[PDB]
Design goal:
The PDB classes it as chaperone/chaperone inhibitor. The entry lists the keywords ATP binding, CHAPERONE-CHAPERONE INHIBITOR complex. It forms a monomeric assembly. Hsp90 Alpha N-terminal Domain in Complex with an Inhibitor 6-Hydroxy-3-(3-methyl-benzyl)-1H-indazole-5-carboxylic acid benzyl-methyl-amide. The protein is Heat shock protein HSP 90-alpha. By secondary structure, the chain is an alpha+beta fold. It has a single domain, classed as Heat Shock Protein 90, CATH 3.30.565.10. Helices cover 33% and strands 23% of the residues. It has five helices and eight strands, in the order E-H-H-E-E-H-H-E-E-E-E-H-E. An eight-stranded mixed β-sheet has the order 1-6-5-4-7-3-2-8, covered by helices on one side. The structure holds the ligand Cc1cccc(Cc2n[nH]c3cc(O)c(C(=O)N(C)Cc4ccccc4)cc23)c1. The site of the ligand Cc1cccc(Cc2n[nH]c3cc(O)c(C(=O)N(C)Cc4ccccc4)cc23)c1 has 19 residues, from helix 2, helix 3, strand 4 and strand 7.
Length: 207
């Protein structure tokens, strides 16, 4: 298990998200679905020149899995996935420019719902989750588990769990007062309102 410090600007953004009074928390779902959709577009595009990239799975979809016992909402996709390099170094350097632009925009009168326009939409997961676990598998690498409860650090380890073939799985360990995001009617309402035009099937699992 490797422990890493977030870049200063990311730790500052994560503290703003956790501490600011903001009732419109539901925006987290649209942001994660949009990230899954981008990964699915990436695998679909690469598969045109190289069809062998779909050997780890042909089906291109998004699964929404609530679990009231574990108090978790899982977002699964069969996108391109991420390598260890994509996960750590790569998607921690790009973020700096967008993070600074977003925080400057917030001071200028913008609200938290505009987060996705700065490519840092993922961090909106901390509006509803006390801990986020990200399991990912890319064709060129092994299966990795990323995790953070904020506090300025994240961990990365080789995942010994159930193999996923290819894609990314976001496990949101929900805060005690955010269990509405485990309700079928609530999730359905959010997807219909903010993610109705996603070009991939979205399956809301029931318990
Ligand atoms: C912990 C962490 C590390 C890196 C990125 C993320 C964001 C994320 N949230 N939900 C996702 C779902 C995804 O399928 C992917 C992905 O594998 N790619 C290939 C798409 C992608 C979208 C947006 C940014 C980077 C990659 C990234 C994310 C979380």
């Amino acid at each position: 298990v490797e422990t890493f410090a977030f870049q200063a600007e990311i730790a500052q953004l994560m503290s703003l998200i956790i501490n600011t009074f903001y009732s419109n928390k539901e925006i987290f779902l649209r942001e994660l679905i949009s990230n899954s959709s981008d990964a699915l577009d990436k695998i679909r595009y690469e598969s045109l020149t190289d069809p062998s990239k779909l050997d780890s799975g042909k089906e291109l979809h998004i699964n929404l899995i609530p679990n009231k016992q574990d108090r978790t909402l899982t977002i699964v996709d069969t996108g391109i996935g991420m390598t260890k390099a994509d996960l750590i170094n790569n998607l921690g350097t790009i973020a700096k420019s967008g993070t600074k632009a977003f925080m400057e925009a917030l001071q200028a009168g913008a609200d938290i719902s505009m987060i996705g326009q700065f490519g840092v939409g993922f961090y909106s997961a901390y509006l509803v989750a006390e801990k986020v676990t990200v399991i990912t598998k890319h064709n060129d690498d092994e299966q990795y588990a990323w995790e953070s409860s904020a506090g300025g650090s994240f961990t990365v380890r080789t995942d010994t769990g159930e193999p996923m073939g290819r894609g990314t799985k976001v496990i949101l360990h929900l805060k005690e007062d955010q269990t509405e995001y485990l309700e079928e009617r609530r999730i359905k309402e959010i997807v219909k309102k903010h993610s109705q035009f996603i070009g991939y099937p979205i399956t809301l699992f029931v318990e």
